[PDB]
């Protein structure tokens, strides 16, 4: 509802209980600048080159989660509000670049309507868990306060393979598997 | 607490015409509901929801706490934008990759891996800007600081047919053009 040339979300603190699950990030124009690893107390930049030009004191992220955790504790006791419903996540799989057989590419698994932000997004190549060449983003915020998150699988396009983005979430009564294959073409 | 609850806070900095204009909102969200918030335009903390009344007054009742918050528009927004952002975000320019491939057939122009989001793709048939039979996907956010967009042209390959995908992007000093002939 508020228009602009640019949106800088400087400070997003997400906290969940029970579990003391926290997430701190910085966004700009909808992309992730960095997230503060709450355990290692380290600012992790999504783009390595950006980290060499700018910096951020992971302490600020730690302070943020401190307050946010307190506030929650207050609200969880100051209200009789009923816990929001476990939304069912929705996944879409698409290639970062135009598929070309035998040419390295990246399968992207975009998962939306995630709530609460607790999920397992895994990849399967021929019904088998892929461990290497997989990267995941932080939980991005949505206007409706649910979240989205992307996972990436580095791969070599071949019609002999069938892939699967497997999503596990409390709001799904069974793991959802989004299939993809260059063979569909 | 035996039940799972989600609390969220965020500081949004809206820039327009650079820093020339800066609106600053702070939002406190609980269980998917925004309850209290600070808008730079309003000048102080407001109870977005009822559960927020206690807090709006409470924080507005602490001169420096409420005066540090109003200053964040300068401490954070203006400062982050005019400094760090100008060396990173505002100067990232990724040149879109452009390719044409077949799909009474359809031509698909894949415009990929570009940044920023701003882009204009156009099809030309014999130096003439084609507009009918054209359709584009929405802007696709790859989540890794790159976007992509696929533009299709429905057509009838008439011998002597020169179809050109025309892409204009800030990372490009000169518009990119890829051509495809019934021959190719």
């Amino acid at each position: 509802d508020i228009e602009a040339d640019h949106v800088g979300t400087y400070g997003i603190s997400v906290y969940q209980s029970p579990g003391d699950i926290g997430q701190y990030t910085f966004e700009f124009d909808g992309d992730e600048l960095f997230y503060v690893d709450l355990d290692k107390k380290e600012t992790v930049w999504m783009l390595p080159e950006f980290g060499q030009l700018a910096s951020f004191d992971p302490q600020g992220g730690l302070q943020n989660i401190a307050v946010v955790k307190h506030n929650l504790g207050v609200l969880t006791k100051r209200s009789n509000s009923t816990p929001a419903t476990n939304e069912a996540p929705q996944a879409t799989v698409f290639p970062k670049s135009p598929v070309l057989l035998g040419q390295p590419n990246t399968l992207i698994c975009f998962v939306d309507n995630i709530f609460p932000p607790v999920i397992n997004i895994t990849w399967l190549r021929n019904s088998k868990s892929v461990a290497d060449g997989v990267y995941e983003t932080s939980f991005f915020v949505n206007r409706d306060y649910s979240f989205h998150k992307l996972s990436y699988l580095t791969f070599i396009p071949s019609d002999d393979d069938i892939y699967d983005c497997k999503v596990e979430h409390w709001g799904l009564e069974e793991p959802v598997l989004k299939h993809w294959s260059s063979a569909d073409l | 607490s035996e039940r799972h609850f989600v609390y969220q806070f965020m500081g949004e900095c809206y820039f327009t015409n650079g820093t020339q204009r800066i609106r600053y909102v702070t939002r406190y969200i609980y269980n998917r509901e925004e309850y209290v918030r600070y808008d730079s335009d309003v000048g102080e903390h407001r109870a977005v929801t009822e559960l927020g009344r206690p807090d709006a007054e409470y924080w507005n009742s602490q001169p420096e706490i409420l005066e540090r918050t109003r200053a964040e528009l300068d401490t954070v927004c203006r400062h982050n934008y005019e400094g760090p952002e100008t060396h990173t975000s505002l100067r990232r320019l990724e040149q879109p990759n452009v390719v044409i491939s077949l799909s009474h057939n359809t031509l698909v122009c894949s415009v990929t891996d570009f940044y920023p989001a701003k882009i204009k793709v156009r099809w030309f048939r014999n130096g003439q800007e084609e507009t009918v039979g054209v359709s584009s996907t929405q802007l696709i956010r790859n989540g890794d600081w790159t976007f992509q967009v696929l533009v299709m042209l429905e057509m009838t390959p008439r011998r002597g047919e020169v179809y050109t995908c025309h892409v204009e992007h800030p990372s490009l000093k000169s518009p990119i053009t890829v051509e495809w002939s019934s021959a190719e």
């Binding site: 700018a54 | 702070t26 760090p84």
Partner: peptide, 15 residues
């Protein structure tokens, strides 16, 4: 060298 980024500071609600 590096230009530091500052963040908003969430306020504490009384318990």
């Amino acid at each position: 060298p590096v230009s530091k980024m500052r963040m908003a500071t969430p306020l504490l609600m009384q318990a």
